[PDB]
Structure formats: C-alpha cells, structure tokens
Amino acid sequence: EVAYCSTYTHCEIHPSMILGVCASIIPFPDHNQSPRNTYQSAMGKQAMGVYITNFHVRMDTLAHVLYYPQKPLVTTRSMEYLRFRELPAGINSIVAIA
C-alpha cells in the first residue's frame, strides 16, 4: 500500500508474550491503569490455593490449602501452559457493585 516500511526482516509470533508469569493471569490487562497491573502481580503471589499435589507427605511449615478451588470463567490463552487449570487458587463469586 502506501505503507510505513517495505523491508521488514522479521515478524512477531504473538505480542502477548511480553508479559511475565504472574502478570499473564490478568484478564484484559490492556484496559487498566498501569500501576494497577503492578500491584496484582505482586499480590497473586500470596493467594491461598493448593500449592502441590503431594501435600500429604510434605511436612512443610506454614502451609495453607483451600477446600474448593475453581478455575476461572474468563481465561487468558497463556494459562494452559503454566497449569492454572489444574492447581487453581480462587473461586468465582457473584459480585454486586452497590
């Protein structure tokens, strides 16, 4: 076309791979203000869930375990690769803003 450039040498796979591990579990992260995405990535590191499947054998100190974990109803496509639907931490609740 009347184009920006015409000598492209490479192309990206998907521009969503520029995010870390704790920041790629946020739905629609391109709609929030920036400092908000920093807080959650330092806050989903201290959410109770099930942390490992053989928690019966390990005599760790200070282990928390949730009864009924659930997987999200609104998921990012880059959560199938870090096993967030096999060891989830949270519950889908019905929230009202009032």
Partner 1 sequence: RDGKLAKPRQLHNTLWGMVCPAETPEGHAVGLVKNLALMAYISVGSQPS
Partner 2 sequence: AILKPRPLWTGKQIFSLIIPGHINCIRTHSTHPDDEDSGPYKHISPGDTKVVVENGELIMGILCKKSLGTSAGSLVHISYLEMGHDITRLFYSNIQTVINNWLLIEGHTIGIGDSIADSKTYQDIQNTIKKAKQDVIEVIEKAHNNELEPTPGNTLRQTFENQVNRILNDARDKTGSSAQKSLSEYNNFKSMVVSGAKGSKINISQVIAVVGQQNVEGKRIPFGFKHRTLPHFIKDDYGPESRGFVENSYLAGLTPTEFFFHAMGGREGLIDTAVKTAETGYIQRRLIKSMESVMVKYDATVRNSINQVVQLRYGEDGLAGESVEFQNLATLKPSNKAFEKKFRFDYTNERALRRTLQEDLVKDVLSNAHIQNELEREFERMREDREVLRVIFPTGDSKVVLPCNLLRMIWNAQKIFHINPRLPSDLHPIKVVEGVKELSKKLVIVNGDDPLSRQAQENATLLFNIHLRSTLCSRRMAEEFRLSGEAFDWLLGEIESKFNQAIAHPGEMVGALAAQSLGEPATQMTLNT
Partner 3 sequence: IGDKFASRHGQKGTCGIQYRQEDMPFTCEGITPDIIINPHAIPSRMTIGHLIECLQGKVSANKGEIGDATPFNDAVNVQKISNLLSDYGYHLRGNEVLYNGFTGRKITSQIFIGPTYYQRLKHMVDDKIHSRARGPIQILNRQPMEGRSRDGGLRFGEMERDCQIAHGAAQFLRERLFEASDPYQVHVCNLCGIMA
Binding site for partner 1 (CB under 8 A): 13, 17-24, 29, 34, 37-39, 41-42, 78
48 binds, among partner 3, partner 1, partner 2, none (CB under 5 to 8 A by kind): partner 3
Torsion sign, CA atoms 55, 26, 44, 19: positive
The yes or no reply on residue 76 touching partner 3 (CB under 8 A) is: yes
The yes or no reply on residue 81 touching partner 2 (CB under 8 A) is: no
Contact 66, 50 (CB under 8 A): yes
- If phi > 0 it is left, if psi is from -120 to 50 it is alpha, else beta; for residue 74 that is beta
Q: Whole-angstrom Cα distance, residue 79 to residue 87?
A: 11
The yes or no reply on residue 39 touching partner 3 (CB under 8 A) is: yes
Contact 90, 47 (CB under 8 A): yes
The yes or no reply on residue 37 touching partner 3 (CB under 8 A) is: yes
Residues that bind partner 3 in the complex, under the rule CB under 8 A: 15-16, 19, 25-33, 35-40, 43-44, 46-49, 64, 66, 72-78, 89-98
